[PDB]
Ligand binder design. Sequence first.
Ligand SMILES: CC1=C(C/C=C(\C)CCC[C@H](C)CCC[C@H](C)CCCC(C)C)C(=O)c2ccccc2C1=O
Ligand code: SF4
Ligand code: SF4
Lengths: 72, 81, 135, 74, 141, 37, 728, 74, 61
Amino acid sequence: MFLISWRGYWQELIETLVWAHERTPLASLVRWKDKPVAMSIVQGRLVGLAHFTVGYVLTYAAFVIASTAGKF
Amino acid sequence: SHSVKIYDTCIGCTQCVRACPTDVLEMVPWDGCKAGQIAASPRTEDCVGCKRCETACPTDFLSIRVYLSNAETTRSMGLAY
Amino acid sequence: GQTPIFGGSTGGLLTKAFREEKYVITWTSPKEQVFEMPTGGAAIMRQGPNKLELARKEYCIALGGQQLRAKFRITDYKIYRVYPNGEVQYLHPSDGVFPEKVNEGRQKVGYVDRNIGKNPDPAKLKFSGMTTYNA
Amino acid sequence: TTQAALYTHHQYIAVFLMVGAFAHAGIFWVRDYDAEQNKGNVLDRVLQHKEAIISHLSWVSLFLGFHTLGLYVH
Amino acid sequence: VGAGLVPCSESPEFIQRAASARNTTADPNSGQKRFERYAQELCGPEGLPHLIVDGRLNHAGDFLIPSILFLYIAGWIGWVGRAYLQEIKKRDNTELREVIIDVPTALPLMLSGFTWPLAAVKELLSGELVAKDDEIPVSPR
Amino acid sequence: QNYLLRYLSLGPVLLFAWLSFTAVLLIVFNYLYPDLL
Amino acid sequence: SFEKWGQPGHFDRTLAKGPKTTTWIWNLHALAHDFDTHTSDLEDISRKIFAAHFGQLAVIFLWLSGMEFHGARFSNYEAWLSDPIGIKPSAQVVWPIVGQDILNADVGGGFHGIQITSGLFQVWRAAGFTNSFQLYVTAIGGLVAAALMLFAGWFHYHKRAPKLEWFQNAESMLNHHLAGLLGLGCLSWAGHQIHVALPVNKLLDAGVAPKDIPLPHEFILNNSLMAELYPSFAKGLTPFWTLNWGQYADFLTFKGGLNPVTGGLWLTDTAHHHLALAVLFIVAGHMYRTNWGIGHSIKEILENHKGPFTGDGHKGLYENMTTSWHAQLGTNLAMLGSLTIIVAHHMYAMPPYPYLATDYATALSIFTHHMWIGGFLIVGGAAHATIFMVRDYDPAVNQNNVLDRVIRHRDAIISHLNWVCMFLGFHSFGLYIHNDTMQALGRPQDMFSDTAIQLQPVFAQFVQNIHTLAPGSTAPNALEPVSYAFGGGVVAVGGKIAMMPIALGTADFMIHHIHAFQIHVTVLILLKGFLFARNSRLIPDKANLGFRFPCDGPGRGGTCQVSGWDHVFLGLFWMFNTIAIAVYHFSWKMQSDVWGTIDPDGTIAHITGGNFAMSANTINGWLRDYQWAQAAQVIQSYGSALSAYGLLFLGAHFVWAFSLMFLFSGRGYWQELIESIVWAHNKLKVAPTIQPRALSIIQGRAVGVAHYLLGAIVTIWAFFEARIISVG
Amino acid sequence: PGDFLVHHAFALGIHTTVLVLVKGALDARGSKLMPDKKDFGYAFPCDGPGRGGTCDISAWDAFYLALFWALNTV
Amino acid sequence: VERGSKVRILRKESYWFQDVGVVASVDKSGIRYPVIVRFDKVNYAGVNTNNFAETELVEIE
Ligand SMILES: CC1=C(C/C=C(\C)CCC[C@H](C)CCC[C@H](C)CCCC(C)C)C(=O)c2ccccc2C1=O
Ligand code: SF4
Ligand code: SF4
């Protein structure tokens, strides 16, 4: 998910989603610590790679130790 | 905002000044070639990073470049909110 | 004080565009015809004055460039930045019709007329924070 | 189970440990490098013929891949 | 031919497979015949033959002459392709004909690849195969 | 007329032609004596 | 007259000059049909569309006649005629050379070949087809008609081409088509049915010597055998002259159910069906105004329907529906797609051909095929809607209309939409994984099926119920319920189920809800691209710049993928997910509690054993209890005579990974590698004059998504094809 | 025979891995169609769509690819 | 090196460095880049025509 989609789509909907808090009542009290925006490009690449590598690591380890301790 | 970079290869067709929608260019008087007025960036603070300008530069190894900095703000990021 | 005939929308001015900045544009249109606005809308203008309020420095310049002079040939429009205090800035028009190359002598601040073959270097320019220009 | 886990553990540790070396070699090439101080020494003579290196490397990769896959599909 | 590999002639499991060896094609002798053709090599416990590559005349021809055949045909095709390319450029209709093949000229070049190896050797000795490091102007860096 | 080849020689149609020629070529030797190993 | 083909770029002025680089090749296969991008004229466009339609029809006729011909000379039909049970139809006999010799699909009677699954013989069990020579003549007729209408297209383009006012008479269009085309064809087919179909169907009850059974000429004027059955069918008694129709109760009846002697329904109902439809939409299609000064002025109807919330109603919509073409294209595509998928969702409960529910191989093949086409083209309908938005519109004729009234308040719509999608999404899936965790956590009482925490879709149950007892009161002149999945008796034949009532317990809930979930997000993506097509809150030049362009530079951070067809990219990914899990669900249920074998007690011993109530509630179960069964033979399903077809499922994974390679990578890397190889080739004097250049990023994205889809769908069809072969 | 096969596979794997790595390394300075990058830095540079696009040119774009090519090898 | 002569390039950053082009028009005016050369190999959008200072050109033949 992080790898394929890119930062030209995950910003249009953040606009309209900022539009909400401004105009609903009983929740417009709170405001922003800091104005939120979409991620960055390099950071997106990095997080995608991190997710991929962590996903790759775990399953194989589980498989190998479980198999070795279950078959001898 | 970001930084702009000018060179000597400006032939002077002035397609970049008609392409930048951000008012960051002007042809200041020159003497060297038949141009007599070479493009430059007086108003960098409104740079956007669209870099539609050098795509309008026909010169071999297009005469303008933009060094895309790191000191962005609400202006350089371009938000209506 | 003239504003075009429109039925209302949902993408106009926001919590920033009256706490930080305002944008306005106005010209002289001796006719009335249908036009399109970048926030979406097909409406009609009126004779003479045509005042419009907006929030971005892109909708205005888009109107000025493509709509007015390239279609309607109108060329007498002011575009004005506004501060939070209500005071105004006059960036452009600065050359009449924004030709962007004609003048009898021009401003002079900063110059770099040098090729790239001799470029700044990491190990030579160090222990400071200057940029790619000072040789 | 113990020795097996240890073996794959250590090899996994090893693999991208080397990638760290190559990456830091790459970043050295931009930050820490002076031209005239090494004019004509062995490093520059490497850079002068990098082309044939990468070309022949692509060559051997293509060869081995093609033929191993062909034998497999055989 | 060691490594504990039995001859395919006397490997029992080899003939065991050969008995009901599924005759592939439309001829009943297809299977059996091929198994008979597989007595020269030497089998193993898997019952199927391995190939030895040493120039050793036990299995020399079973790998050498196919290699040389491939070298023949690859040399021919590469040679005729390069020759055609060299020829096209002396027409000043370069990229017009790059997609439209000139058959009346493309034929004899193909037909004239008979003696590619030794002719190539000549172009090696004459030095008619390489251009000069700096004459070739393809800029690196 | 014989101008058809002027408009049949395109490359692509010639590609498939040559490839099918070579294919049936490879077939007949595999069709006539597929019994030499 | 052959001096003209080999002059490429005949339609474009730019790429007509010469192929500078390889790019010139690519665009050659890209702009060969959008001739709206060639001029501003329209009569030429319309003529091209006519000729292209004729060509498509020609290839249609060609392929259908050729498939017939294969069915006549290389298909075991006439042997499978006498026995449609103990014989499995086949075609495409294998050519006896090295490689394809063991693949002789022998289906009894020594007939080898390829065991097909497309159920054309089923049509050929209703059309009453005895000898293959008549079929030979049929193919000849099909191909000659193909050539005929192709010649007609040539003529109507090169000699006498139609004029321009010939386009926009949608009134006569609807009238002629609706009435003449549909009604006359349908009533003609019904006439064929009553004359030939049910007679030979009667004659297919006990082995009545098929070829010996007379030919239609023996019934054109020979009413004696026609007077054997149906005493009112002496001639007809022609009581229609007397307005009396009570005599015709013989054939033109209303049964409405399964006929356990045909493997399908009662054909008389279908005949009377077709009659009723014919006259009904004949009198319908006689509506609109034409050349006799009588009828609806349809451009005034839409003028009338306005009001307080409407604004000004449907004013000004015909300029859009006739001046532009992509509009019509998109809407008709969407409608056809929906129609097709309901067809798919339809013909597994009311089999309209002989031997359908008893034949457990063709069913899901037809089903999944049509279902895939449905979505696969409705997304294209939406895409053409968007292309209309970018190509055709008007600020003048679109004041305050029901169209313009949404493009002004799009943000609220899409925000509430996002809200709904988020809600449904986790409300369903997180609930699912919650139950997953509970089962893995020794807390089984926190499960959600009947044996645990409760939820029951009462609405479906009550609607099915009120459908069960329909006849008598709602349907007095009706004999059996419309189907037997709602209610009725378990209808069957042999030890083989035809239709039983379907049970909706707990697992139905989240399945239907995630269906709705994905449909919601799909609509979200597509409609988002639709509205935000011309102007975004940041990009006010979209329509001013195009709809097929990669990005707008690294301004505002990033802006890559801001066109619309990338929106439809993401959408097609999502619809892939939707339809894939949909077919998963359908196949698993209709093999778990609908299909199996039967005992003399009517004892339905289903294939799997009702696995949803057991495992279709947790994720780990979903992989275990579905693909364990869906593959446990494909590993070994090769290795003998009628097994040798080593399937390309092992092969499709490769294309899938090769696909995903194109997605994750840029292009500059490939460009530089290309330049290095060019350096080498130039050193050895073999430099190709036409300078190769790497693919454009949109081109690469397209080929990546194409290969992705191809691999996935190939994989899945291989899966269930072999799975049905293991039982059919 | 199998060991013959897989060992050649290892050869291939490390060959392409070092290929992409040395390509990125020796491009840490600049490319034929983008020589300036030496001053742009071991950083983002994207160089928007000059010729079909120039995404993934930033001197450790290669690092991602190399990481994949190492993971499958190991 | 005249109007219609094939010469190679000395400008380093040039896309056609060391590559040969034909001197289309020999200008010799006060501009720093008099010589107008034409090539056929394409850089960005085909700038096969360019100008140089003829103190940056060398003939071949
Ligand atoms: C999803 C996605 C986003 C959107 C991602 C965003 C907005 C970040 C997600 C928001 C945060 C990270 C969610 C986590 C919030 C936690 C629940 C709060 C933590 C507090 C607990 C520790 C208590 C991008 O910006 C993007 C950019 C470029 C390429 C791809 C993508 C991409 O795929
Ligand atoms: S940079 Fe380009 S547009 Fe600007 S003056 Fe130079 S040649 Fe003209
Ligand atoms: S991105 Fe380019 S066009 Fe826009 S302001 Fe900066 S230099 Fe000018």
